[PDB]
């Protein structure tokens, strides 16, 4: 006997289904409701003949050892008699697991069989149990078995007092999160934000209402400053700027932007300024041209950085098309715009600024709510997204972009599953994790959630599926790297009386931290490293064993799929005279080594990261 597999993310499809005379849609077998059915198509006449099939794509490779069929309770029509059950891993080749005849009664029917690996299970209904008509119906279908064991492992869920739809890592193993004026909904311009800080050492959460900056910071641009503060601008109070200080856990008011905006992207530049572009979610539709903030001057317009060349072809128009730009600081101090629009751009922020076409992202379509992650110097991985923000099929496609000497784009391997609303996380070994999202982008839904993250390795350009998480993470979810090398994932929903809010998170331990058996792997240690350093300097780092590879991982803020802060700079060490002492040479180019808080990870020869130290780089 096996227990039911979780059904999060499953998608049902069928040979045929009724919609005209009743709601007989295939999806109805997955809703938990005994009163909603898949029904084979019978109208308009003529009715679709037997046999009929119902296919479930689980979105992951489970071990399947049985199937439970719950017939409708209201009449006998369409009870399945003769059945077959097939399994597939690739969706192309099918293996027969079971064949039989179910009795003509209302009992839930269970079929068991030897466990089989499968992503897809198909039920074929070959007869109607009482030969009453050419019909098949099913109220619910469950699949019995066990989820994959690894790679990687997930913590139990972590309680939050709000949906953490924005997050930022702080020094000292703490995570700042916030929602909006409410823990569970958004709306208006009421100048209040609910926040919650998770202490990753103890699990304690500290909740605070932030009213002193007159800013509801839902839907903002975010970035980390050189001095460690977090600058948040726009969103529900579209003109506002607020600054968080991790040393005192307080916010301070900043200066207003010139034009109000929301769902824009903000990026810290080589000079420690913050550039912003786009964002028609709030503050008015369109004309969300570039501006740049300095600590001494506040926000100033960039007259020669118009928004126009970043717009996608979103069917929703201006409200959506300037949202969530994939912006990166680049060598020499420009900003590179990698998407989501097909067209990419180089942006200068000096003087009045400039914009220059960088050509298209090869043959990519628009990829709104896709991810872009800087996993090495001048090296970006982009993946997922959909051409529309709303009601749009997502892609599995992924493209690399090398901006070291010009712009070189190449399609790389597809992910195993399409995603929109996922999050991308650079890991210190150079791999990039993608987590969450869903197959068909519809804000505030968990339908078609992608439950298994995938890890892309630049050395192979392949995606490997990770063990699945428990909670779906779609619109309004976040994920980011932690200083111990694990990954926080959380949020989703923020839709009030909706049923899809997730006031929680889960922590993923990636494969590089585990022994084969899932226990914690022994890791290298940093014994001594400087708390601060300046671009272009050499630093000396002491470890508990001989290490030659280190990774500087810039700390992150993230919301609405956007994380302009994270980036990996790998460095090779030169061994010196002491007890595992080594010298690292920091790049002088602050367009690459953007000033701010970094996690310094020692990487052993097995690819195992130390716990990072924090280094504030100027």
């Amino acid at each position: 006997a096996s227990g039911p597999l979780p059904r999060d993310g499953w998608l049902a499809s069928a040979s045929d289904q009724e919609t005209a005379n009743e709601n007989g849609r295939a999806a109805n077998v997955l809703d938990g409701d005994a009163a909603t059915l898949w029904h084979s198509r019978y109208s308009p006449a003529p009715a679709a003949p037997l046999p009929h099939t119902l296919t479930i794509d689980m979105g992951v490779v489970n071990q399947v050892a049985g199937l439970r069929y719950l017939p409708r309770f209201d009449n006998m029509n369409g009870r399945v008699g003769g059945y077959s059950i097939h399994a597939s891993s690739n969706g192309t080749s099918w293996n027969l697991l079971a064949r039989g005849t179910w009795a003509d009664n209302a009992d839930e029917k269970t079929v068991t069989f030897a466990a089989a690996s499968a992503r897809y299970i198909r039920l074929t209904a070959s007869t109607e149990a009482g030969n009453r008509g050419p019909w098949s119906s099913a109220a619910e279908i469950n699949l019995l078995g066990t989820p994959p064991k690894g790679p990687g492992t997930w913590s139990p869920t972590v309680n939050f007092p709000l949906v953490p739809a924005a997050a930022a890592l702080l020094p000292g193993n703490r995570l700042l999160t916030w929602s909006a004026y409410s823990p569970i909904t958004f709306g208006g311009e009421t100048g209040i934000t609910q926040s919650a800080i998770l202490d990753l050492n103890t699990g304690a959460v500290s909740q605070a209402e932030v009213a002193n900056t007159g800013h509801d910071m839902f839907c903002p641009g975010t970035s980390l400053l050189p001095d460690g503060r977090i600058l948040v601008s726009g969103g529900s109070n579209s003109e506002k700027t607020s600054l968080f200080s991790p040393a005192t856990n307080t916010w301070a008011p900043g200066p207003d932007m010139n034009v109000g905006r929301g769902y824009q992207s903000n990026v810290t530049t080589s000079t420690g300024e913050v550039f912003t572009l786009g964002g028609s979610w709030s503050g008015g539709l369109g004309s969300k041209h570039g501006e740049i903030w300095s600590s001494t001057g506040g926000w100033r317009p960039l007259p020669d950085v118009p928004v126009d060349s970043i717009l996608t072809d979103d069917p929703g128009g201006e409200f959506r098309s300037d949202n969530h730009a994939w912006l990166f600081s680049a060598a020499g101090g420009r900003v590179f715009h990698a998407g989501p629009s097909r067209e990419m751009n180089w942006i200068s922020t000096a003087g009045t600024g400039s914009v220059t076409s960088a050509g298209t992202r090869a043959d990519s379509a628009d990829a709104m709510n896709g991810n872009a992650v800087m996993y090495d110097v001048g090296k970006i991985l982009t993946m997922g997204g959909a051409p529309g923000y709303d009601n749009s099929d997502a892609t599995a496609r992924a493209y690399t972009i090398d901006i070291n000497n010009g712009v070189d784009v190449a399609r790389t391997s597809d992910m195993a599953v399409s995603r929109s609303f996922a999050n991308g996380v650079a890991l210190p070994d150079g791999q990039v994790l993608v987590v969450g999202g869903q197959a068909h982008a519809v804000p505030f839904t968990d339908t078609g959630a992608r439950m298994a993250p995938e890890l892309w390795n630049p050395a192979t350009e392949e995606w490997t599926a990770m063990a699945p998480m428990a909670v779906p993470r779609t619109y309004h979810s976040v994920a980011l790297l932690l200083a111990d090398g694990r990954v926080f994932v959380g949020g989703g929903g923020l839709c009030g009386t909706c049923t899809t809010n997730h006031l929680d998170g889960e922590i993923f331990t990636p494969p590089y931290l585990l022994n084969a058996d899932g226990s914690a792997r022994t890791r290298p240690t940093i014994v001594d490293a400087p708390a601060t350093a300046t671009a272009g300097s050499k630093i000396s780092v002491t470890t508990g064993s001989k290490i030659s590879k280190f990774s500087l991982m810039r700390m992150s803020s993230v919301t609405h799929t956007v994380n302009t802060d994270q980036r990996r700079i790998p460095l090779t060490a030169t061994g010196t005279y002491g007890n595992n002492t080594a010298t690292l040479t920091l790049p002088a180019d602050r367009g690459v080594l953007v000033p701010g808080a970094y996690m310094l990870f020692a990487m052993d020869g097995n690819g195992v990261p130390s716990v990072a130290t924090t280094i504030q780089i100027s």
């Binding site: 938990g32 409701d33 005994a34 009163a35 719950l70 619910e140």
Partner: peptide
Amino acid sequence: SHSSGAA
């Protein structure tokens, strides 16, 4: 399972 009933 749950049920929303019939209308």
